[PDB]
DNA sequence: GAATGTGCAACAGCATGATCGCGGCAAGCTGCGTGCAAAAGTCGTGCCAGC
RNA sequence: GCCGCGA
């Protein structure tokens, strides 16, 4: 109960010291959840194809009274499973069927219908499906799609950093960013002027668009400003009192309250005077005339005598204007605030900038602005203003955009119209005014609450919506001329645009790349990858330094360590272990609630915005039995910082120490002891290791190996396993327990392991079973381990005995010295699978035909070809051996006498047919694994193809006979029980078949009911068995509907074993890497007193400068683990009693300092104890978690337990001279990884090959026989050396001298070593290009 | 390159291949190091006609 | 920052490539006064490091007047530098490339001994490319 | 301006051909509209279109937007395709790719001399194929070129012998990818090794900025007599010891070697042997190897120095000096003419570089090359002997 | 008379002329009556403008 | 006391941003039509020369 | 050309 059936095989000694609250999630939930919400049905229109259909459908013709009313949709069953689809090289997808009906309405009767044709579902498009692991098998490829991280649509305020005009004036701007549509920008000029950049056009004042909303200038001033009223009656010219307004001002004259002096002229301005004035209730008071001179009138008062009026808004007043308004009877005059203490002069300045004061004028002005083309006719302007903004279809904010809008402007409601309204622009303009006024602050662009993450499902949704819009565009046109006879197939379905768009997105896109296939770790880290690039993202060059830094909000959401190094540092990230996605699309991380002083187990997921308010505790905070904090003072993070708070002020608690670290960096033990950059290097390099011949568990790990291995889908996990019935190297058959079962037909579980199969990186994928026979297997158990996995535990390297010491300079710099035993034991030996393809297809003169017989080829090359012209399986090919014999017919219809006698002396063809046969490319060798001949339907099947189909049939019937055998056994048991119930003949009844003629009839009830029903069950079971077997038979042998030109395809797979060698690249998982320098014999390597030599020799100098202390700690701890394993092995050698071995195992497991590991052998079976002790005889595979791992004291006491030195260093003797080294050397066991950088793919040499017709220079790179480019810098170095002749030979006679090359070759073959230079063709090409312009360039004499 | 070519075209100037980059582009011996000896002898021939 | 260093190296190489030693000795009397570099109160560069491998444009007079230590137009090396530092000399007049006075190149005397070898630089050495590479080789390690 | 090929006999027209054919189409339609006495408006528009097409062809992206092909990318014109990055970077002006060139991962060889480098014999026999053909034709093994080619492909033993004969003293120049200064490309004498990785002498790595953690380097064959002399006299590693930036020796021992000498030249208050008086440095080595004395023991040794005060001559002086066993052992590799006080220190990466500089300035070039090689040998050997290790 | 034409720019395939009227090395610099193709080393495709 | 040019500052457009390698995809496929003379090529047909 | 990778 405490441990499942996989764990009792081998238990990792956890060091822990901190209990876990929430277990690690599925580790691949983002992709699966995204596609499930994209695919699965929805009763509402939240998301998915249903939501897209709601967005597009229904559609109707323009007043044509014809509409397309659809109901529901359905995805078809794929015709091929993942295995067959991958083998054949086609895309794994499903057909899409949709039900829609014609409704034709009455033209004479309004809102009346005459026809309703409810046609059945129609097919359109083929939607690729995601596998169970998170990959899209398209074109026989894996193609994982990376999640994108971009700017969330909404409102963003920016400060520009305040250095644009060098005057120190900080410019605050606002950006309106939609999910789909045109952007908007509100900018502030240095003269404090509103400007609007719409769709990134030229700068335009905001007053035009403000008036375009049917807003008058007086109304605009009233809305955007606070108005005051000045009363001038009987020449008193009183002023209203607003005490909160006048904060900074100079009293130009005496200010009296109700005839009593309140504030003198130029008196005190302190808050005491303002408070005293406010305390005294005073009505309006008179003011000096000169004060009102600077005021600006807001409204437009009308003269009662004549129609003439002072309508000049945003203007001052004159002394004669006072008399003019007094004559007109203007007792009260409305003037704007005119106050500059916190507010400022805005809006009115822009209105003074532009004189357009009409909606028509604003519309025509913006029409001429965005579009310099034809002027409008009162209709183009209105239509464009409707289409650009506040449009249902042309412009659309997403729901996340609306919620960000509401949050940014402090609005109670969250839901709302997906479009922007009139008050919206007013609100954002007011907020932009306020932020310059002082209230509010600018937000952070790189805040993780302002960055959204879109997954595969959302992108596929957008692509499908685009395709649906494209289809509807012509669906509308088709309905115009459609009669009643038209059905949906003939109603312009247009599946082609939908399929083309979907395939273009899924196959050829920026964020759909080849999945890495080195170890399961690379697949895991690639599937949960976060890319800042993409269609809607930012280009590499558009990124700055701030975008590539670690924002303090990256704590529990984005890994700070794992990221690419050179060009893409900071632009690509990995999700943290516990990080998930919010409903709107923002990253959340879990935390534990804190109530009073006790930390409860309840968990809340907090996003970037939410977690900035609460005070979050630390994972490394000690707790009590009841959960209370041991210390009254605890370190915490409050608002982007780190401080120390009381135990009562803590709001949330970090769930675990791994929360900050992603999957890739979680497998680095003692990560906290390594430098951050070296840790990054190690995390990057862990994903490049290749699986070896035999997986080897890490003697020191972090406990995340099991989760990574199981959650990657690389292994085989028992879905509902019971007890194992049959184990094979390629099949596992499990009989499910009777406690849980599906009623009727019983059933068993069959797993078909994938044998040696080429990966994406040409590595090998293999699966080997872990269960032997009759082993009880629980649900979720591990049956078979994939490449680089041991007993369901991730294992992508090998444990090696390592000594840190300089050895004759053979480990100089980062070089590695490796003993010969490493090569002997086939460690670090890998299998690489390569696929070769040859295709037959028709041409001008006939069919390209594949045969063993090939003209003008000796019998030596035909020894390895069968009677159909293919290699024997398992034949060892090397060099340019012939794989498949393909002959291409040539053309000749004029049999000249020479050709006649040629055909007479030789065969009828007389070798007229040319050969184009697949030969192994040079430098490629190995054994042939499989052949996958594919044939076109109608043509004669290949001879080897018949054997392939026979093998497929035999496998199908063999794997199908088990359930039928079980079912007939059950029926026979039931019949036997029935016959024992009455008229039992004992063994004689079992002697005669067919239940001894159904035991005659016996009783009437048994004959009429029991025997008849049993016979009926037998008959229908046999009929169903025959039907399903025949269906599978017909399915397997079906002619392929292949490509047109292609008639036949054959594919050959080659396997080669790549053994370790000096130049190869090997590295650990702490960022230490190197290239081997020498393979040392056993006798030459250092050995200890016991005489066992070390395996790897490493340079100590790499440690103190790189700060990789995890290297030394891991070596010491692996030495301790291997010492424990050696003790267990020695005790097993003498076959002592199980009790004392159990006691030693118990004592070893309980070692530690308050470790949360409660493994006990008292409840452990004796045979189970024996098996466990036999499993870890190599070494005790302990596990130290990332940020709470083993301490030095624990490691030293573990070393003491295993009878090893406490310091971790032993006396080493030189293997060649036998002399002891003066200082002790730290010998340990370190997990080394063989990276995918091998010299067999990095060794190139060319003397003379192919060139390009342009510039006549040699081609570039390997796989093309290219030469090493001599760039500008090396030529500069040649000039600096003064080596002019070497430079001349490197510029002319080596690259671009068409005759110089041949002359040099002839001279060297002769043995002259003469230059004879010439004129490079590149300069002649340049001259021709320049002359091809209007420029004449020539060579003088 | 656009700016330099226009000014060079209208002026009708000549390069004369006196520096290192010009001789590298053409492919002759650069007037430095071992190629200095060859370039000096050629100059006297041009001077002497 | 590697791109910013490589661009500077490209510009320096381009601007300095057309410079080779074409003359043995121009015979100019111009030069540069050279003193140990001191910022405030501490010594940051002694005279020996700065003046080593350079040709004196003028005789250096010891504190004793009318006393000639090393004549004009001579190459300074380790022995001469040690003899000079033995006395109390502070400033030395040393000819430089900016005052070579020669046309289309630099004199072999105005340019001191090449830093690669102990001997004086010989005619035909492309000094511009060497100088540009020497200046631009760092920068990848400059902390910006 | 070749047009691209692809599946079938179809040929996809290129960018330059697209611009040229657009110009021809516009010109043909405009010239045919001239003879029809068409209204001035259409002829005006067609002339404008022809002018725009010509401007796009000659320099795409000027005076308007840049026209695009099938994809949404600019159709690069004559100006954009002058040579690579609009100048002469790519196919001209030091942009040429060259043959007789190899490339592979570099490892360390501590047995190599300063002028030697390890070359794979599989990389060879390819870079030196014409020379092998010439030697095969010269020695009568193959009369015709076809026979020599076939027997080189078959790779017989005599082919390997002739490759060894050809390689004997033909220098080959190695360079690393980011060639910063002139010392980033250096000539070496190749020695054939049975592998696939280039073995590089450690002392030059500091000049190459090269470390053995995955670095790769390229090989070029100076296949000319003048080129061979230039590689031997101007490019050889033994030739450039002082860097042409400050004059300090760029070839200096580092890493293990510095640890090898530093551990050797150290003193301990008590060790095996105190105050022993020994006649020569040979006896110090004898005692250290026999195990009767320690490297850090303080002893008095009778040591003879050579001095160069005599004009072009060396004088020998013998004296009893108090030193350690390690310094006495190290004294056996230094050349004559250097004072003993050059090794009576700790030798912390600054005294050894100073001693190399003094050896160059006082003796010459061959003695300091041999001295550097011996220093690197003894540093590696005694670093291995010391067994230095880093623990927790 | 197109961008890729054989009457100018030289022949397409070695010393062979279009229509096969004069396709030998014996003929040199001869204009065929049927087509203006002349017999040349077919490298003049790099030189004729 | 009003009038007329020289300096000047903000502004829009152009040019540039390290080197050398390795591995995978996905495309990129481009333009008539016309009716007749004028020519050339072809097919059904009959011919002589060899066995 | 994109994408990923090595120094
Ligand atoms: Mg490196
Ligand atoms: Zn001079
Ligand atoms: Zn012709």
Exposed e or buried b for every residue in C45-69, given b needs 16+ CB within 10 A? eebeeebbbbbbbbebeeeeeeeeb
Strand ranges for A1147-1283 from DSSP E: 1182-1183, 1227-1234, 1244-1246
* Residues D115/D365, Cβ–Cβ less than 8 Å: no
- Tell me the chain A residues in contact with residue B29 when contact means C-beta distances shorter than 8 Å: 1284-1285, 1288
Q: Which of residues 267-296 of D touch B (CB under 8 A)?
A: none
CA–CA separation, A677 vs A621, rounded Å?
27
* Residues A1279/B32, Cβ–Cβ less than 8 Å: yes
Which of A1198, A1283, A1303 to substitute to test the interface with D, most D CBs within 10 Å?
A: A1283
CA–CA separation, A910 vs A904, rounded Å?
8
Q: Does the nearest atom of strand F lie within 7 Å of D64's Cβ? A: no
Q: Which residues contact D21 (CB under 8 A, 6 or more apart)?
A: D13, E3
Residue A166 CA, nucleotide F13 C1', distance (Å): 21
Q: What's A446-482 look like in SS3? A: CCCCCEEEECHHHHHHHHHHHHHHHHHHHHHHHHHCC
User: In which element (H, E) is residue C86 found?
Assistant: helix C78-86
Task: Give resolution, Å, one decimal.
Answer: 3.5
Strand F proximity: list residues 3-32 of B with CB under 7 Å: 3
Residue D151 CB neighbours (<10 A): 18
Contact between chains at E46 and A1328 (C-beta distance less than 8 A) = yes
Minimal CA–CA distance to A1148: which of A1108, A1182, A1118?
Answer: A1182
Distance of alpha carbon A1204 from the chain centroid: 46
Contact between chains at D20 and E4 (C-beta distance less than 8 A) = no
Residue D29 CA, nucleotide F34 C1', distance (Å): 19
Nearest-10 crossing angle of helices A1138-1149, A1109-1133: 170
Q: What is the DSSP string of D112-165?
A: --TTEEEEETTTTTTTTHHHHHHHHHHTTS-SSHHHHHHHHHHT-HHHHHHHHH
Q: What is the DSSP string of C17-62?
A: SS--EEES-------EEE--EEETTEEEE-HHHHHTT-BBSSPPBP
E neighbours by CB contacts (3+ pairs under 8 Å): A, D
Residue A307 CB neighbours (<10 A): 6
CA–CA separation, A593 vs A600, rounded Å?
6
What residues pair up with E23 in beta bridges, in sequence order?
Answer: E16
- How many residues make up chain E in this entry? 49
Which CA distances in Å does A914 have to A845, A890, A910, A1068, D93? 12, 7, 11, 53, 45
Q: What is the DSSP string of A343-400?
A: S---SHHHHHH----SHHHHHHHHHHHH--SSPP-SSHHHHHHHHHSS-SSSSB--HH
The residue of chain A with its CA nearest to that of E48 is: A1328
User: In which element (H, E) is residue A266 found?
Assistant: none
Residue in D180, D245, D361 nearest the CB of C115: D245
Backbone angles phi, psi at A1012, to 5 degrees: -65, -45
Minimal CA–CA distance to A232: which of A325, A335, A309?
Answer: A325
Which CA distances in Å does A221 have to A216, A295, A318, A423? 9, 14, 21, 15
The residue of chain B with its CA nearest to that of A1337 is: B9
CA–CA separation, C75 vs C113, rounded Å?
8
Q: Any idea what DSSP says for residue A1009?
A: I
CA–CA separation, A762 vs A835, rounded Å?
8
* Residues D181/D240, Cβ–Cβ less than 8 Å: no
Nearest residue to F11 via alpha carbon and C1': A165
End-to-end CA distance of chain C, in Å? 8
User: In which element (H, E) is residue A652 found?
Assistant: strand A652-654
Return the structure tokens found at A974.
């039931």
Task: Give the ligand whose atoms come closest to the C-alpha of residue A1074.
Answer: 1
CA–CA separation, A513 vs A861, rounded Å?
40
A1282 touches chain C (CB under 8 A): yes
* Residues C114/C52, Cβ–Cβ less than 8 Å: no
Q: Which residues contact A987 (CB under 8 A, 6 or more apart)?
A: none
Cis peptide before D320 (omega within 30 of 0): no
Minimal CA–CA distance to A1311: which of D236, D220, D148?
Answer: D148
Which nucleotide is at minimal CA–C1' distance from A687? G5
Handedness of CA A46, A51, A56, A60 (dihedral sign): negative
Backbone angles phi, psi at B14, to 5 degrees: -125, 155
Q: Which residues contact A363 (CB under 8 A, 6 or more apart)?
A: A212, A376, A381, A382, A385
What residues pair up with A1220 in beta bridges, in sequence order?
Answer: A1213
* Residues A582/A607, Cβ–Cβ less than 8 Å: yes
Minimal CA–CA distance to D327: which of D359, D355, D360?
Answer: D355
Q: How determined?
A: cryo-EM
Distance from CA of D56 to the nearest CA of B (A): 15
C87 touches chain A (CB under 8 A): no
What residues pair up with C120 in beta bridges, in sequence order?
Answer: C113
The residue of chain D with its CA nearest to that of C137 is: D180
CA–CA separation, C92 vs C96, rounded Å?
12
Nucleotides of F under 7 A from a protein CB: 10-12, 14-30
Token pair 């009223």 is found at A229
- How many residues make up chain A in this entry? 1341
* Residues D59/D81, Cβ–Cβ less than 8 Å: no
Cα C22 to averaged position of ligand 2 atoms, centre (Å): 10
Contact between chains at B34 and A1282 (C-beta distance less than 8 A) = yes
CA–CA separation, D38 vs A526, rounded Å?
64
Return the structure tokens found at D98.
């060259």
Return the structure tokens found at A561.
């360590």
Which CA distances in Å does A795 have to A678, A917, A1272? 21, 42, 45
Nearest-10 crossing angle of helices D15-34, D40-58: 160
Residue in D99, D182, D222 nearest the CB of A1267: D99
- Tell me the chain D residues in contact with residue E3 when contact means C-beta distances shorter than 8 Å: 17, 20-21, 24
CA–CA separation, A958 vs A1249, rounded Å?
54
Which CA distances in Å does A1223 have to A1212, A1216, D140, D386, D387? 9, 18, 61, 6, 5
Backbone angles phi, psi at A184, to 5 degrees: -135, 145
Distance of alpha carbon A981 from the chain centroid: 65
Which nucleotide is at minimal CA–C1' distance from D97? F20
Return the structure tokens found at A814.
């980062």
Task: Give the ligand whose atoms come closest to the C-alpha of residue C107.
Answer: 2
Cα C11 to averaged position of ligand 2 atoms, centre (Å): 25
Q: What's chain E look like in SS3? A: CCCCCCCCCCCCECCECHHHCCECCCCCCCCCCCCCCCCCCCHHHHCCC
What residues pair up with A652 in beta bridges, in sequence order?
Answer: A593, A616
Minimal CA–CA distance to A1214: which of A930, A876, A808, A837?
Answer: A808
Nearest-10 crossing angle of helices D145-154, D157-167: 100
Minimal CA–CA distance to A488: which of A49, A43, A44, A57?
Answer: A57
Nucleotides of G under 7 A from a protein CB: 1-7
3-state class of A1240 per DSSP? helix
CA–CA separation, A1295 vs A1289, rounded Å?
9
Cα E10 to averaged position of ligand 3 atoms, centre (Å): 12
Cα A814 to averaged position of ligand 1 atoms, centre (Å): 8
CA–CA separation, A745 vs A1024, rounded Å?
12
CA–CA separation, A238 vs A227, rounded Å?
16
Q: Which residues contact A542 (CB under 8 A, 6 or more apart)?
A: none
* Residues A68/A100, Cβ–Cβ less than 8 Å: yes
CA–CA separation, A1192 vs B13, rounded Å?
78
User: In which element (H, E) is residue D249 found?
Assistant: none
Pairing of strands A1046-1058, A934-935: antiparallel
Return the structure tokens found at A604.
């809340």
Contact between chains at C130 and A1280 (C-beta distance less than 8 A) = yes
Q: Any idea what DSSP says for residue A1221?
A: P
A1074 touches chain D (CB under 8 A): yes
* Residues A1089/A776, Cβ–Cβ less than 8 Å: no
Show the CA angle centred on residue A744, arms to residues A742 and A747, nearest 5°.
60
Contact between chains at A1275 and B27 (C-beta distance less than 8 A) = no
End-to-end CA distance of chain D, in Å? 66
CA–CA separation, A605 vs A621, rounded Å?
20
Cα E41 to averaged position of ligand 3 atoms, centre (Å): 15
Residue in A1324, A1325, A1331 nearest the CB of E49: A1331
Handedness of CA A162, A163, A164, A167 (dihedral sign): positive
3-state class of A717 per DSSP? strand
Task: Give the ligand whose atoms come closest to the C-alpha of residue E12.
Answer: 3
Residue C44 CB neighbours (<10 A): 9
E35 annotated among ligand-binding-site residues = yes
Show the CA angle centred on residue A978, arms to residues A972 and A984, nearest 5°.
100
CA–CA separation, A161 vs A163, rounded Å?
6
Return the structure tokens found at A981.
């119930």
Exposed e or buried b for every residue in D286-309, given b needs 16+ CB within 10 A? ebbeeeebbbbbbbebebebeeee
User: In which element (H, E) is residue D283 found?
Assistant: helix D281-290
Return the structure tokens found at A122.
């129609």
Residue C143 CA, nucleotide F17 C1', distance (Å): 19
Residue in D106, D180, D388 nearest the CB of A805: D388
CA–CA separation, E37 vs E8, rounded Å?
7
3-state class of A334 per DSSP? strand
Distance from CA of E43 to the nearest CA of A (A): 10
3-state class of A114 per DSSP? strand
* Residues D38/D47, Cβ–Cβ less than 8 Å: no
3-state class of A844 per DSSP? coil
A neighbours by CB contacts (3+ pairs under 8 Å): B, C, D, E
3-state class of A107 per DSSP? coil
Distance from CA of A41 to the nearest CA of B (A): 60
């Amino acid at each position: 109960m405490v441990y499942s059936y996989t764990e009792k095989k081998r238990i990792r000694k956890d060091f822990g010291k901190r209990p876990q609250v929430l277990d690690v999630p599925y580790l691949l939930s983002i992709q699966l959840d995204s596609f499930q919400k994209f695919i699965e049905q929805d009763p509402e229109g939240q998301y998915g194809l249903e939501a897209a259909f709601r967005s597009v459908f229904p559609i109707q013709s323009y007043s044509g009274n014809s509409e397309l009313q659809y109901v529901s949709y359905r995805l078809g069953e794929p015709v091929f499973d993942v295995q067959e689809c991958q083998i054949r090289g086609v895309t794994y997808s499903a057909p899409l069927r949709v039900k829609l009906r014609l409704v034709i309405y009455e033209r004479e009767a309004p809102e009346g219908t005459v026809k309703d044709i409810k046609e059945q579902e129609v097919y359109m498009g083929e939607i690729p499906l995601m596998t169970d692991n998170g990959t899209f098998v398209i074109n026989g490829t894996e193609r994982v799609i990376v999640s994108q991280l971009h700017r969330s649509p909404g409102v963003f305020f920016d400060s520009d950093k305040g250095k644009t005009h060098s005057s120190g004036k900080v410019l605050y701007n606002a950006r309106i960013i939609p999910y789909r549509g045109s952007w908007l920008d509100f900018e502030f000029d240095p003269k404090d002027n509103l400007f609007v950049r719409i769709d990134r056009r030229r700068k335009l004042p905001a007053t035009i668009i403000l008036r375009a909303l049917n807003y008058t200038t007086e109304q605009i001033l009233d809305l955007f400003f606070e108005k005051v009223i000045f009363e001038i009656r009987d020449n008193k010219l009183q002023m209203e009192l607003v005490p909160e307004r006048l904060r900074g001002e100079t009293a130009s004259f005496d200010i009296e309250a109700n005839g009593k002096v309140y504030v003198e002229k130029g008196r005190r301005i302190t808050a005491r005077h303002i408070r005293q004035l406010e305390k005294d209730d005073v009505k309006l008071i008179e003011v000096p005339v000169e004060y009102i001179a600077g005021k600006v009138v807001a409204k437009d008062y009308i003269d009662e005598s004549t129609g003439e009026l002072i309508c000049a808004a945003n203007m001052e007043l004159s002394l004669d204007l006072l008399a003019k308004l007094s004559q007109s009877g203007h007792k009260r005059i409305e003037t704007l605030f005119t106050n500059d203490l916190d507010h400022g002069p805005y809006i009115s300045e822009t209105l003074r900038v532009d004189p357009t004061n009409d909606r028509l004028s604003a519309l025509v002005e913006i029409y001429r602005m965005m579009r310099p083309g034809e002027p409008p006719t009162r209709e183009a302007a209105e239509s464009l203003f409707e289409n650009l903004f506040f449009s249902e279809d042309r412009y659309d904010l997403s729901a996340v955009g609306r919620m960000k809008f509401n949050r940014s402007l402090l609005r109670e409601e969250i839901e709302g119209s997906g479009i922007l309204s009139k008050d919206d622009i007013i609100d954002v303009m007011k907020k932009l005014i306020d932020i310059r006024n002082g209230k509010g602050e600018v937000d952070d662009i790189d805040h993780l609450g302002n960055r959204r993450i879109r997954s595969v499902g959302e992108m596929a949704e957008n692509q499908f919506r685009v395709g649906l819009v494209r289809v509807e565009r012509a669906v509308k046109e088709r309905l115009s001329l459609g009669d009643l006879d038209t059905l949906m197939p003939q109603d312009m379905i247009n599946a082609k645009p939908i399929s083309a768009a979907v395939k273009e997105f899924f196959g050829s896109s920026q964020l759909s790349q080849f999945m890495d296939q080195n170890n399961p770790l690379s697949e895991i880290t690639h599937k949960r990858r976060i890319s800042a690039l993409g269609p809607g993202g930012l280009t590499r060059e558009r990124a700055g330094f701030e975008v590539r830094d670690v924002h303090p909000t990256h704590y529990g959401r984005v890994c700070p360590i794992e990221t690419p190094e050179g060009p893409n540092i900071g632009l690509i990230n990995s999700l943290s272990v516990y990080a998930q996605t919010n409903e709107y699309g923002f990253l959340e991380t879990p935390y534990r609630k804190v109530t009073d002083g006790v930390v409860t187990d309840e968990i809340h997921y907090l996003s970037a915005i939410e977690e900035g308010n609460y005070v979050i505790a630390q994972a490394n905070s000690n707790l009590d039995e009841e959960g209370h904090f041991v210390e009254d003072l605890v370190t915490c993070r409050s608002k982007g910082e780190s401080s120390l708070f009381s135990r009562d002020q803590v709001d949330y608690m970090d769930v675990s120490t791994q929360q900050v670290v992603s999957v890739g960096a979680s497998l680095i033990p003692f990560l906290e002891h390594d430098d951050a950059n070296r840790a990054l290097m190690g995390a990057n390099m862990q994903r490049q290791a290749v699986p070896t011949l035999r997986a080897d568990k890490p003697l020191v790990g972090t406990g995340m190996e099991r989760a990574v291995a199981v959650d990657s889908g690389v292994t085989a996990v028992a879905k509902r396993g019971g007890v194992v019935q049959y184990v094979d190297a390629s099949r596992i058959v499990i009989k499910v327990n009777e406690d849980e079962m599906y009623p009727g037909e019983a059933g068993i579980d069959i797993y078909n392991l994938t044998k040696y199969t080429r990966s994406n990186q040409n590595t090998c994928i293999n699966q080997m079973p872990c269960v032997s026979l009759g082993e009880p297997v629980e649900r979720g158990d591990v049956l078979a381990d994939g490449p680089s996995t041991d007993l369901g535990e991730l294992a992508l390297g090998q444990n090696m005995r390592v000594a840190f010491m300089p050895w004759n300079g053979y480990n100089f710099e980062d070089s590695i010295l490796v003993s010969e035993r490493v090569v002997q034991e086939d460690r670090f030996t890998t299998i690489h699978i390569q696929e070769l393809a040859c295709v037959s297809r028709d041409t001008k003169l006939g069919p390209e035909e594949i045969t063993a017989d090939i003209p003008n080829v000796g019998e030596a090359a035909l020894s390895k070809l069968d009677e159909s012209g293919i290699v024997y399986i398992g034949a060892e090919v090397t060099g340019g051996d012939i794989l498949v014999g393909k002959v291409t017919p040539k053309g000749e219809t004029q049999l000249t006498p020479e050709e006649k006698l040629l055909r007479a002396i030789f065969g009828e063809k007389a070798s007229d047919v040319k050969d184009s046969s697949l030969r192994v490319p040079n430098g490629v060798s190995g054994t042939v694994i499989d052949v996958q001949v594919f044939t076109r339907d109608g043509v004669e099947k290949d001879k080897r193809a018949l054997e392939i189909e026979e093998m497929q049939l035999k496998q199908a019937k063999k794997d199908l006979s088990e359930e039928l055998q079980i079912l007939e056994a059950g029926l026979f048991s039931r019949i036997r029980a029935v016959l024992v119930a009455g008229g039992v003949e004992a063994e004689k009844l079992d002697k005669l078949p067919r239940d001894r003629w159904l035991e005659l009839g016996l009783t009437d009830e048994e004959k009429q009911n029991q025997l008849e029903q049993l016979a009926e069950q037998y008959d229908e079971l046999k009929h169903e068995f025959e039907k399903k077997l025949e269906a599978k038979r017909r399915k397997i042998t079906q002619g392929d509907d292949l490509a047109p030109g292609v008639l036949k395809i054959v594919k050959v797979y080659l396997a080669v074993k790549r053994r370790i060698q000096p130049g190869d690249k090997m590295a650990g998982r702490h960022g230490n890497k190197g290239v081997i320098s020498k393979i040392n014999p056993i006798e030459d390597m250092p050995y200890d007193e016991n005489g066992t030599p070390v395996d790897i020799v490493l340079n100590p100098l790499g440690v103190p400068s790189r700060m990789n202390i995890g290297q030394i700690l891991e070596t010491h701890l692996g030495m301790a683990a291997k010492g424990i394993g050696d003790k267990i092995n020695a005790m097993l050698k003498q076959q002592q009693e199980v009790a004392k071995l159990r006691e030693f195992i118990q004592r070893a497991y309980d070692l530690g300092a308050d470790v949360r590991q409660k493994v006990d052998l008292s409840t452990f079976s004796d045979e189970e104890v024996m098996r466990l002790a036999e499993n870890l005889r190599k070494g005790m595979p302990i596990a130290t978690p990332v940020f709470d791992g083993a301490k030095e004291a624990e490691i030293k006491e573990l070393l003491k337990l295993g009878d090893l030195p406490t310091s971790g260093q032993i006396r080493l003797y030189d293997g060649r001279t036998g002399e002891q080294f003066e200082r002790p050397v730290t010998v340990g066991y370190m997990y080394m990884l063989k990276l995918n950088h091998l010299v067999d793919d990095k060794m190139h040499a060319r003397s003379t090959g192919s060139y390009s017709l342009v510039t006549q220079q040699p081609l570039g790179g390997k796989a093309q026989f290219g030469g090493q480019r001599f760039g500008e810098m090396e030529v500069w170095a040649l000039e600096a050396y003064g080596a002019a002749y070497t430079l001349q030979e490197m510029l002319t006679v080596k690259s671009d001298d068409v005759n110089g090359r041949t002359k040099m070759y002839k001279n060297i073959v002769d043995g002259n070593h003469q230059m004879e230079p010439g004129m490079p063709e590149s300069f002649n090409v340049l001259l021709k290009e320049i002359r091809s312009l209007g420029i004449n360039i020539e060579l003088e004499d | 390159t656009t700016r330099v070519l226009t000014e060079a075209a209208v002026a009708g100037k000549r390069d004369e291949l006196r520096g290192l980059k010009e001789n590298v582009i053409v492919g002759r011996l650069i007037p430095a190091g071992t190629g200095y000896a060859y370039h000096q002898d050629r100059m006297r021939r041009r001077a002497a006609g | 920052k590697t791109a910013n260093s490589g661009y500077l190296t490209r510009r320096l190489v381009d601007v300095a490539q057309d410079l080779v030693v074409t003359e043995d000795d121009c015979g100019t009397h111009e030069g540069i006064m050279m003193t140990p570099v001191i910022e405030g109160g501490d010594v940051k560069e002694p005279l020996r490091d700065r003046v080593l491998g350079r040709v004196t444009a003028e005789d250096v007079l010891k504190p004793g007047t009318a006393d000639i230590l090393v004549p004009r137009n001579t190459l300074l090396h380790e022995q001469w530098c040690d003899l000079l530092e033995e006395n109390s000399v502070d400033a030395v007049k040393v000819r430089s490339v900016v005052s070579c006075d020669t046309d289309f190149g630099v004199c072999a005397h105005c340019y001191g001994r090449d830093l690669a070898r102990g001997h004086i630089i010989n005619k035909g050495e492309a000094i511009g490319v060497i100088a540009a590479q020497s200046i631009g080789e760092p920068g990848t390690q400059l902390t910006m | 301006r070749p047009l691209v090929p692809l599946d079938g006999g179809r040929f996809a027209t290129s960018d330059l051909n697209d611009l040229y054919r657009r110009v021809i189409n516009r010109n043909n339609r405009l010239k045919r509209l001239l003879d029809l006495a068409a209204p001035d408006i259409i002829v005006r528009n067609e002339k404008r279109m022809l002018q725009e097409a010509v401007d796009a062809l000659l320099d795409n992206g000027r005076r308007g937007r840049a026209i695009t092909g099938s994809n949404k990318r600019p159709l690069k014109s004559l100006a954009d395709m002058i040579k690579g990055k609009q100048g002469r970077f790519r196919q001209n002006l030091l942009g040429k790719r060259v043959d007789y060139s190899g490339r592979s991962v570099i490892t360390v060889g501590p047995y190599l001399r300063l002028h030697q480098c390890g070359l794979p014999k599989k990389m060879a026999l390819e870079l030196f194929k014409p020379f092998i053909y010439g030697k095969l034709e010269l020695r009568g093994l193959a009369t015709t070129i076809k026979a020599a080619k076939k027997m080189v492909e078959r790779e017989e033993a005599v082919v390997w012998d002739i490759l060894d004969e050809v390689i004997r003293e033909h220098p080959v120049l190695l360079n690393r990818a980011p060639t910063l200064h002139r010392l980033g490309i250096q000539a070496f004498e190749p020695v054939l090794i049975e592998g696939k990785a280039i073995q590089l002498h450690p002392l030059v790595c500091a000049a190459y900025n090269a470390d053995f953690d995955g670095d790769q380097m390229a090989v070029h064959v100076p296949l000319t007599l003048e080129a061979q002399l230039e590689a031997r006299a101007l490019m050889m590693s033994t030739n450039n010891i002082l860097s042409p930036a400050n004059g300090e020796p760029i070839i200096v021992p580092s890493q293990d070697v510095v640890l090898g000498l530093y551990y050797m030249t150290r003193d301990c208050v008590n060790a095996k042997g105190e105050g022993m008086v020994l006649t020569g440095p040979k006896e110090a080595e004898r005692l250290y190897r026999s195990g009767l004395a320690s490297l850090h023991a303080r002893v008095k040794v009778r040591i003879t120095e050579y001095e160069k005060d005599a004009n072009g001559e060396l004088v020998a002086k013998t004296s009893l000096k108090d030193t350690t066993v390690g310094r006495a052992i190290l004294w056996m590799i230094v050349p004559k003419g250097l004072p003993y006080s050059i090794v009576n220190q700790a030798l912390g990466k600054k005294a050894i570089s100073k001693m190399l500089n003094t050896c160059y300035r006082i003796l010459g070039l061959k003695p300091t090359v041999i001295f550097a090689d011996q220093i690197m040998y003894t540093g590696f050997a005694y670093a291995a002997r010391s067994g230095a290790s880093v623990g927790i | 008379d197109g961008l890729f034409c054989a009457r100018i720019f030289g022949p397409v395939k070695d010393y062979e002329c279009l229509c096969g009227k004069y396709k030998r090395l014996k003929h040199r610099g001869v204009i065929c009556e049927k087509c203006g193709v002349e017999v040349t080393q077919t490298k003049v495709r790099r030189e004729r403008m």
